[PDB]
Design a protein around this motif. Sequence first.
Motif, PDB file in Angstrom:
ATOM      1  N   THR A   1       0.938  -1.064  -0.017  1.00  0.00           N
ATOM      2  CA  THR A   1       0.028  -0.238  -0.178  1.00  0.00           C
ATOM      3  C   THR A   1       0.906   1.286  -0.015  1.00  0.00           C
ATOM      4  N   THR A   2       1.979   1.190   0.681  1.00  0.00           N
ATOM      5  CA  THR A   2       2.819   2.383   0.922  1.00  0.00           C
ATOM      6  C   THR A   2       4.069   1.973   1.499  1.00  0.00           C
ATOM      7  N   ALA A   3       5.314   2.282   0.776  1.00  0.00           N
ATOM      8  CA  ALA A   3       6.511   1.898   0.684  1.00  0.00           C
ATOM      9  C   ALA A   3       7.138   2.269   2.220  1.00  0.00           C
ATOM     10  N   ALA A   4       6.820   2.965   2.847  1.00  0.00           N
ATOM     11  CA  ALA A   4       7.231   3.438   3.930  1.00  0.00           C
ATOM     12  C   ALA A   4       7.383   2.353   5.277  1.00  0.00           C
ATOM     13  N   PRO A   5       6.488   1.380   5.753  1.00  0.00           N
ATOM     14  CA  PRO A   5       6.965   0.095   6.542  1.00  0.00           C
ATOM     15  C   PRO A   5       8.146  -0.624   6.035  1.00  0.00           C
ATOM     16  N   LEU A   6       8.270  -0.960   4.623  1.00  0.00           N
ATOM     17  CA  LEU A   6       9.048  -1.970   3.978  1.00  0.00           C
ATOM     18  C   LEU A   6      10.681  -1.026   4.149  1.00  0.00           C
ATOM     19  N   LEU A   7      10.635   0.091   3.844  1.00  0.00           N
ATOM     20  CA  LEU A   7      12.046   0.877   4.378  1.00  0.00           C
ATOM     21  C   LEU A   7      12.513   0.558   5.884  1.00  0.00           C
ATOM     22  N   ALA A   8      11.597   0.741   6.668  1.00  0.00           N
ATOM     23  CA  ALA A   8      11.571   0.647   8.100  1.00  0.00           C
ATOM     24  C   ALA A   8      12.207  -0.723   8.696  1.00  0.00           C
ATOM     25  N   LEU A   9      11.553  -1.685   8.102  1.00  0.00           N
ATOM     26  CA  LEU A   9      11.827  -3.096   8.336  1.00  0.00           C
ATOM     27  C   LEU A   9      13.153  -3.700   8.058  1.00  0.00           C
ATOM     28  N   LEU A  10      13.894  -3.452   7.050  1.00  0.00           N
ATOM     29  CA  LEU A  10      15.279  -3.673   6.697  1.00  0.00           C
ATOM     30  C   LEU A  10      16.141  -2.977   7.596  1.00  0.00           C
ATOM     31  N   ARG A  11      15.930  -1.773   8.307  1.00  0.00           N
ATOM     32  CA  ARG A  11      16.841  -1.120   8.902  1.00  0.00           C
ATOM     33  C   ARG A  11      16.498  -1.862  10.609  1.00  0.00           C
ATOM     34  N   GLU A  12      15.248  -2.307  10.923  1.00  0.00           N
ATOM     35  CA  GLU A  12      15.092  -2.976  11.998  1.00  0.00           C
ATOM     36  C   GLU A  12      15.898  -4.156  12.130  1.00  0.00           C
ATOM     37  N   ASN A  13      16.462  -4.288  13.409  1.00  0.00           N
ATOM     38  CA  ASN A  13      17.480  -5.438  13.582  1.00  0.00           C
ATOM     39  C   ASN A  13      16.867  -6.482  14.416  1.00  0.00           C
ATOM     40  N   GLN A  14      17.070  -7.727  13.642  1.00  0.00           N
ATOM     41  CA  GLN A  14      16.590  -9.100  13.792  1.00  0.00           C
ATOM     42  C   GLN A  14      16.506  -9.707  12.423  1.00  0.00           C
ATOM     43  N   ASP A  15      16.889 -10.815  12.377  1.00  0.00           N
ATOM     44  CA  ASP A  15      17.343 -11.690  11.122  1.00  0.00           C
ATOM     45  C   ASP A  15      15.991 -12.004  10.515  1.00  0.00           C
ATOM     46  N   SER A  16      14.825 -12.255  11.325  1.00  0.00           N
ATOM     47  CA  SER A  16      13.524 -12.710  10.660  1.00  0.00           C
ATOM     48  C   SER A  16      12.945 -11.567  10.206  1.00  0.00           C
ATOM     49  N   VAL A  17      13.118 -10.453  10.917  1.00  0.00           N
ATOM     50  CA  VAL A  17      12.427  -9.111  10.385  1.00  0.00           C
ATOM     51  C   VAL A  17      13.110  -8.747   9.040  1.00  0.00           C
ATOM     52  N   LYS A  18      14.447  -8.839   8.696  1.00  0.00           N
ATOM     53  CA  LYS A  18      14.992  -8.453   7.653  1.00  0.00           C
ATOM     54  C   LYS A  18      14.812  -9.598   6.340  1.00  0.00           C
ATOM     55  N   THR A  19      14.362 -10.678   6.717  1.00  0.00           N
ATOM     56  CA  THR A  19      13.814 -11.707   5.804  1.00  0.00           C
ATOM     57  C   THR A  19      12.615 -11.395   5.108  1.00  0.00           C
ATOM     58  N   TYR A  20      11.593 -10.898   6.326  1.00  0.00           N
ATOM     59  CA  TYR A  20      10.257 -10.303   5.870  1.00  0.00           C
ATOM     60  C   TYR A  20      10.496  -9.118   5.331  1.00  0.00           C
ATOM     61  N   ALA A  21      11.507  -8.075   5.383  1.00  0.00           N
ATOM     62  CA  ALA A  21      11.495  -7.154   4.321  1.00  0.00           C
ATOM     63  C   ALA A  21      11.389  -7.397   2.781  1.00  0.00           C
ATOM     64  N   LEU A  22      12.337  -8.276   2.454  1.00  0.00           N
ATOM     65  CA  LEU A  22      12.618  -9.164   1.242  1.00  0.00           C
ATOM     66  C   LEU A  22      11.200  -9.472   0.500  1.00  0.00           C
ATOM     67  N   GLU A  23      10.443 -10.339   1.446  1.00  0.00           N
ATOM     68  CA  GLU A  23       9.281 -10.971   0.836  1.00  0.00           C
ATOM     69  C   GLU A  23       8.088 -10.001   0.528  1.00  0.00           C
ATOM     70  N   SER A  24       7.736  -8.858   1.405  1.00  0.00           N
ATOM     71  CA  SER A  24       7.115  -7.704   1.122  1.00  0.00           C
ATOM     72  C   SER A  24       7.344  -6.852  -0.116  1.00  0.00           C
ATOM     73  N   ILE A  25       8.395  -6.681  -0.028  1.00  0.00           N
ATOM     74  CA  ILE A  25       9.324  -5.774  -1.228  1.00  0.00           C
ATOM     75  C   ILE A  25       9.114  -6.372  -2.572  1.00  0.00           C
ATOM     76  N   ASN A  26       9.243  -7.788  -2.691  1.00  0.00           N
ATOM     77  CA  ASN A  26       9.246  -8.240  -3.969  1.00  0.00           C
ATOM     78  C   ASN A  26       7.838  -8.255  -4.746  1.00  0.00           C
ATOM     79  N   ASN A  27       6.852  -8.424  -3.785  1.00  0.00           N
ATOM     80  CA  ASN A  27       5.176  -8.621  -4.120  1.00  0.00           C
ATOM     81  C   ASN A  27       4.687  -7.374  -4.766  1.00  0.00           C
ATOM     82  N   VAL A  28       4.975  -6.108  -4.198  1.00  0.00           N
ATOM     83  CA  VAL A  28       4.559  -4.986  -4.855  1.00  0.00           C
ATOM     84  C   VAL A  28       5.579  -4.230  -4.877  1.00  0.00           C
TER      85      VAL A  28
END
Lengths: 96, 475, 266, 284, 50, 51, 71
Positions: D1-28
């Motif tokens: 919907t808007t790219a602002a969480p996806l930016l925040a999530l890569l910068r968030e520290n934890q391996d699982s949240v970084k993997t999550y950033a990738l999956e969201s990013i590629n779909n839209v």
Amino acid sequence: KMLMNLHKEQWQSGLKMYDYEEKEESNLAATKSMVKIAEQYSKRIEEEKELTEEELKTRYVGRQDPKKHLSETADETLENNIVSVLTAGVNSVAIK
Amino acid sequence: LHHSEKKYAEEDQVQELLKVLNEISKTTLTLDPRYIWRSLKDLSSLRNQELLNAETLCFTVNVLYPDSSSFKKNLLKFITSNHKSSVPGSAELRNSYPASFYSVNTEKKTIEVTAEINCFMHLLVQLFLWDSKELEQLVEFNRKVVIPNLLCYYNLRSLNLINAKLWFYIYLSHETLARSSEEINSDNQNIILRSTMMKFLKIASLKHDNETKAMLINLILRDFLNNGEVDSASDFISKLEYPHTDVSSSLEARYFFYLSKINAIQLDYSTANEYIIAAIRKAPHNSKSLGFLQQSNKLHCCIQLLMGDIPELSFFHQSNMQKSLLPYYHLTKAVKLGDLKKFTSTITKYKQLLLKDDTYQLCVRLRSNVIKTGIRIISLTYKKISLRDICLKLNLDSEQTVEYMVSRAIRDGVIEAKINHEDGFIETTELLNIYDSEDPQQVFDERIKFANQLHDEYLVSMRYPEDKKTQQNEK
Amino acid sequence: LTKSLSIAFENGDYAACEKLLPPIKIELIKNNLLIPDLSIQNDIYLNDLMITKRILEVGALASIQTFNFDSFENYFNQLKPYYFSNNHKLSESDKKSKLISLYLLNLLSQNNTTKFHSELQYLDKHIKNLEDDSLLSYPIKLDRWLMEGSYQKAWDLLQSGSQNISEFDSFTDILKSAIRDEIAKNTELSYDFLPLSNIKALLFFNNEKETEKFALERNWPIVNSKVYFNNQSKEKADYEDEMMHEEDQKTNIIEKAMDYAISIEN
Amino acid sequence: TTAAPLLALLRENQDSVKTYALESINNVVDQLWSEISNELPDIEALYDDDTFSDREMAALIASKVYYNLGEYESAVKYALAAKDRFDIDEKSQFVETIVSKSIEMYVQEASKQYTKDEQFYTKDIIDPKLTSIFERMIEKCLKASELKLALGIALEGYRLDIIESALKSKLDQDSTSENVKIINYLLTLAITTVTNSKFRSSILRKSFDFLMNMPNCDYLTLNKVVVNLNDAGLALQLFKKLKEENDEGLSAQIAFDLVSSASQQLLEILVTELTAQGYDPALL
Amino acid sequence: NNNSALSNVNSDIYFKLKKLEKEYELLTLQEDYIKDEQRHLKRELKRAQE
Amino acid sequence: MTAAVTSSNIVLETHESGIKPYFEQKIQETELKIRSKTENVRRLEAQRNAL
Amino acid sequence: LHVAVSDSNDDVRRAAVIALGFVLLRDYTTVPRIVQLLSKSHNAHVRCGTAFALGIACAGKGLQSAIDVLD
């Protein structure tokens, strides 16, 4: 090669700048003369827009063409003054 | 009665159809169908509006249909059903006619001719809605279809030109719906609207059609500007693909407006000046264009005040814009005379008027510019003047308060002075006479670069109409 | 587990938040999957939304309170689309109004003024009269005073700004410093010299020994109780001449005249 | 919907949240492309790291983002850096953009490497990936029917062995009139497009053996190959085949044609060799 | 379709295009040249005016 | 022959034929280029014809 | 093409114009466009050789553009 050569400072004559009195003269004349051929250029294009091209050019001074002549003077004085600026900028920096 | 009227609308269309149609099946001749399409829309608005409203359904029966007649019936059904004299033998003009596809040839086997006619039909739907001034249900229904229709098939050079206008209608109706009334839905469709256009720009790069790309960028840009996302618009324009190749002067006017506006709030006023001065002149100057033109004039003056320069009092007076240019005149006057008390009353009083034209956020920033003009005058008029006298004149609080104003201001070179702290005055440093300085050379070179731009710009364009016109046959 | 973050904030132990947060971050992904991230909103989703949101908001305040500005920035970004989509029926909180006040202070304190105005434009239509300006006044009025160039009105709003604590003292203390550097730059142009006493009043200190120390580090020598603003300015300038890109940007006489002739002659 | 969480999530520290950033990013990413173009180093960081197994996914994100950007060249390196999950997009005809870009690249490299040694795909000197993509791109032409679309691809890629494997897929006598034409077109192209001495000589002579194998062929095609290269060796062999298909009209028709067409140098050498071998004095 | 060997001749189109756009590189040859010809005639214009 | 009742190619060469404008993408990008070349080469011809 | 324009000897210019036809025996279609320029110019030796270049090149069966230039 014997004919093509000239002096030993003909290949060393672009460093030979002119007296600037004479260059001022060149500046002054070209601007003045162009005012008068421009006046001539205004008269020409007031009419000249009915039919038959040669007739119109005979009527409104389109022969003895000022349009051609105004461009010519401008271009001529324009190429000179690019080199004159070039000359001065080289000689001031190069020597001292 | 009814039948008579339907045959006439159909006949009138056939002519219009022929013009664009004969060219495009020869081979694409991109530019020429585009200019005709502009004329065609205008004649179709009058055609559709008068002589009943069931003409569109008829026009459909006349051409080939796989599912085209079906789709059109549903549109008409909504605005109360029609199917009288709208069925073959009474909305059928073919019967062995080859322009409208020979009937034998239509029955007999495969190869489609559905492409160009389908696309054309959609355009007519858009226009049909817009004339009615009903959007709602019909618009939502029509919207859903046409998007998966354009992408089913892979577009031709000509077919691009028709969607470059089609999208403009889908964009606009949705903006009007969203601004009518707020819902959970209003937020949902905004998301879908952005997604389709932005993907469609990718495709259109590779097909080589500039006109589709040019329209899309305008629309997308308007979208960030509305929803106040400065941040999204700044990325779009820095990852350029805008064409200057094949556009209308319409398109350059929209583009240059959106650019100026966006740049303003992000504290760059200089390039915005270029953009808005540019936009007005490129726009066609007419009394039916008065909406877009009126919006540009309001912005431009406001942008001059942001620089600390002042647009003409002459400007507001000789216009026939006077009614709408009623607030701006006072906004300029308040800044020009540098009285802060006037400026505070003005922006309160016109608060409703300005909010509409959304220069209101810019008016808040102009309060800086007020002060700037008011101390500029003092320095120019009295060269050497104690901070004490400046307090008397402009009602500053103290010596200190004004000291800080100047100190900040001269970093930016606005007042162009230097303070004498120990003697308690401000001593102005402007004195001119830069015909001793080497300053004229830079100035002059910027003028010679404008003159060189005009030189390149004539040379390319002059021969170009001539070469085409010589190639085409003549006596 | 999930619920522990929520009650941990109420304790007042705000480092305990952060050391608890990593499990809750893995469990926050599970929360995100329940909502579609608001591409449709329903009433099943409306209960869930409160859950997703509550975790972010208490992390957000907790991070500011341990002076982890970085972590705060990421939180704010996640949260923003959630208030943004949909007709209101759970699109605001008591916490929100306070949260926007804190982000606006972070931009000012880093002196990214460019993004301070962009962000306010986007912000405007959520706070116009709907949350109104009630706490938001504090970075807004400060801003009005900085644009005008009243460093004086600006100083007072900070000074009175310590009586009311919500948690804004983590950015007030930084903004105190921001002002001094801005003043320090402007006064170089104004004059070459200010007596030691006149420096203290302008650049906002409470000790005459701090005023002198700040000057030494900033590259002004106090010799004979007169500052020499000109020093730093000469040194910055010397450095630009030291690096070379340099001949073309200024442009030589020779270079201008060579450019004319070749434009013509193509 | 808007790219602002996806930016925040890569910068968030934890391996699982970084993997999550990738999956969201590629779909839209055809709505949301602009913003993640700026925040590209974090995406390159994940690629590097062998402490994720969604490293492939991060190289994949980088190829989409570049496509939307307009900077298609780097896209190929990063599309091929992901390896798998590229087939998904190889049968997608909205992003066959990078699939096609890799081939356009191949042509450029091949013209350099063709002077090093004739074979340079079969020796490894170039990337294995660039070679694998080419030979699956050929596979698509042969799903659609006919070898002709492929022939043209390979000529441009200076793959000589591919041209041979393709031409033999049409020698078995499917129908001789078509089989001669399929050669005919390829000769006419080879003379006018490739002007490189070695490659052009190869295609004509390689064509000569394929043409010979069917006992029924135009001998108009065969004569063109001889005349263009002006070799006596092709000319001699041409008559050895005609010597086991000899009769008075057929074998004279080609000899009468051959003198008209060919140059004075071919003719002078050719007569001597047929006499030393044994032939009618009428042919000569 | 209704007429087969529609996949041999589809590729002959492609084959023809790669030829033809090389012969419009013969107009890009010419383009440099009409720049060096007018250059030469501007020179001989000087010499005729002299 | 013509209709739209009956789908072209008997629907088996519309997606095994959409891998084909990508073979041809290289030549049509370059064809676009060529159209500006044509305009230019008479552009400068006119100048030298007058000259 | 270079030899033709840039060499200041008339005899030199000619020999270069005439030559073009030998090279372009293979494709004779485009040749009247190359020489359109060279026929425009009014040098005796160049025009004399424009005429020949076209003669050698566009032999066989006629070409409508070739015929037109020669006129």
